[model samples]
Target: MQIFVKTLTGKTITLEVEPSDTIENVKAKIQDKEGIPPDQQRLIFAGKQLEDGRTLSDYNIQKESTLHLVLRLRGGMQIFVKTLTGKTITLEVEPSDTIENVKAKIQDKEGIPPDQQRLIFAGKQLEDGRTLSDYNIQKESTLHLVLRL
Candidate 1:
């Protein structure tokens, strides 16, 4: 069966594997293609992270189902942001950092109040309590920062 895996880097790669293939085996193959370490790779399907020992069939993953791949940053990852004023800002953040943390950084760097900041990515407004990795946010990902009146 062939499945589509979308990386935080915005690349979608297809892998052909058997239903009996374990999630860990898939991760290993993804590591080969995506360069993300197995330990750092988090494969999410149906809003849950797939366990390594579990088989693809166990998860009931259908053909062409998209698996979101998030990577844990050993150091910090840098994010690029475009402000409403049309200024581009770069911020260094950890994968474990929450969306609120990103807002705070923008507040400090761009002089936009956190309360007034609205961060949007992939056409959806970013919510609080979600970490960068939780949103599958990665290096070079474009995020738009707008201020609300």
Candidate 2:
């Protein structure tokens, strides 16, 4: 099966995955070229978890499906970012929550692709590829992301 990964360089890689391959193996391949680790990764396609250890055959993922694996950065999230759970969000989505996973959350609420979303803060565009502090998001609060054109 084929997976489409979007990189920090804004480039996309169309790679093939064997049904017998483990998630770790795919992680190694993408990380070798893109620098993303397994624990820090989120494999998302069609707004699902893309559950760990499962293969394309297991999930019924196909040749044309796109799987986004992005860096899970910290501190860059906004102060007003909300959780998918109602009222009591006991699970904190740390840096382990990859951009792709968070994108699923945003998509759940906003109902759109992430490319149209923007992380606006301090009157500037948040630069990709680092923790929140690297983009002036040093505060330890929920990130306030906005949807845009």
Candidate 3:
């Protein structure tokens, strides 16, 4: 049967799954498709959280059922920032954090001012007004930092 996985950011992932499939198996599939760690993914159906060891049938999840995906709130996710000088710095940031806030964190770690930093992910320049989620930034994803003259 096919099911839909809806993310917090309004993205939908369609998957073909069996009723015998465990919640852990589903999370693994999500990780393969979206790069989110299994441990960090929470699946909810009918307002009840799914258990890792339980089967989809246990929750009575049927064909085309929509499961909501939420990230485990554990402070924040870690991502990498590659600077112009060829240095990669790891930083923890919240998905809701704006690009400007990320630059501030970079500044705190490397002494580069936020205004002088330009962050790019997936070849697109990040706008300071938007959030990491707006860019679909995932855990362990890398962002390129360019220094402004």
Candidate 4:
């Protein structure tokens, strides 16, 4: 009966919720514990979205397991490339993936090394060691990382 609940604050809390409880029931407990707005709750795992009202079991969320969820933050990073004729390069990535990971995929597709590409935002650099989800990345979101040669 030990279900591990991950909060928006990146804190993992294990609580005992009955197996018959609905997802909403779990959400309420989460809301009280993490202070995440019920309306803004988003549960994601392995780069897939979880539908509302669906039991954890329906989504294959196991009991006595850990569920990783993040608050749906504003997404979409766009930057115009002056070298590519000001062409816009966009990447649809989950926070679960890092800019480095996206770069690797882009690199594999575009033919380059993810490590060579620079992913900068707000004057801060993103480390390749962490996944974008660590940054609380949401679904269907496009993040722009400038590829400077």
Candidate 5:
């Protein structure tokens, strides 16, 4: 099958893949063509994030469909979040932004109350009062989101 990939660079490219090819394997191709790390790439189709372990046919991705790619950039502070419920979210913010600001955004998107949102980056629970830099948060970082039950 052939699909169109839209990258964060605002460049769109085409790829010919097999229906049996896993999304994870397709990302390997994206890494080669887009020069982006496979782990840093998020593929979206039909408003859903594609699963790496699933095959293209699993999503019923047809030929000529468009798969959007979200690439992690080196600029600013990029945060990858994995929720307790197994959902993935990405946040792009200024290093000077406070942890509270991050929580606010997550609350807006994930609908988890900001007060109930807990963030752990680099094995440290982030306090709302501190800036991201206070915890030495750099680009391409992951944070575990522990929201209230």
Candidate 6:
């Protein structure tokens, strides 16, 4: 059987699946195609959240059935960083991510050296040893990045 996975952005992808496939199996396929980790995917069908151990047949999911994929924000969250150049980059981070981890990710995406990156949130400079939750950071929060000489 075939099914459709719809994202929050209104993009849909079709997957060939079996009625006996478990939710985890489906999630694995989604992760392969969408690059989203299975732990971060929440599949909703007919207003019900699918369980990992349950089979598609258990949910009565059939061919052409559409399942909504909602991203989980518990283990990971999306935050934005405004650069000195006025460009905002969205980053995926964990609440337990240290400032240094954030800097490394910035370096990966923006090619900015971690040692030269000074992150500021809520008017206070973030310390390398501190986790995002230490500063009460939440999803979609914007942090400011200034380069250090």
Q: Which candidate do you rate higher for lDDT, 1 or 2?
A: 1
Better of 3 and 5 by lDDT: 3
Ranking by lDDT: 6, 3, 1, 5, 4, 2
Tens-digit lDDT string for candidate 6 (1-149): 88999999999978999999999899999989989998788899999888777899999999999999999756447899998789888788889999999999888656679889989999998999999999999999999999897
Clashing pairs in 2: 75-132, 76-132, 77-143, 78-142, 78-143, 78-144, 79-142, 79-143, 81-143
Clashes of each: 0, 9, 0, 4, 0, 0
Candidate 3 scores a C-alpha RMSD against the true structure in Å of: 13.9
List clashing residue pairs in candidate 1: none
Q: Write the per-residue lDDT of candidate 2 for residues 1-149, one digit (tens) a residue.
A: 67777665767877778777665676777777766666577776666756555667766666766676666754343334543343211123444344455455565544558776565556665544444444544334545466564
Looking at model 1, residue 128 earns an lDDT score of 77
- How far is 9's C-alpha from truth in model 1 (Å)? 3.8
TM-score of 1: 0.48
- Against the correct fold, how does model 2 do in TM-score? 0.43
Show the colliding residue pairs in model 6. Answer: none
Q: Rate residue 140 of model 2 by lDDT.
A: 48
What digit string (tens of lDDT, one per residue) describes model 4 on residues 1-149? 76786766768967677656767777788788867776567666546555445666666666677777767654564322122335444444555666666667666434557766766543456678777666554544334456656
Regions more than 4 Å wrong, model 6:
75-149
User: What value does the lDDT take at residue 102 in candidate 4?
Assistant: 69
Candidate 3, residues 1-149, lDDT tens digits: the string is: 99999998989999999999999899999999999998688899999878777899989999999999999756658999997788888778889999989988886656688988989998998999999999999999999999887
lDDT against the true structure, per candidate, is 0.85, 0.58, 0.89, 0.61, 0.84, 0.90
Question: Per-residue lDDT for 42-75 in model 5, tens only?
Answer: 8999998887778899998989999898865455
Error of 6 at 23 (Å): 0.3
TM-score ranking from best candidate downward: 6, 3, 5, 1, 2, 4
List residue ranges in candidate 1 displaced over 4 A. Answer: 74-149
Q: Which has the better TM-score: candidate 2, or candidate 3?
A: 3
User: For residues 35-127, what per-residue lDDT tens digits would candidate 1 score against the true structure?
Assistant: 778878888999987877788999999788889988876565778999777878877888898988999888655567888888998888999
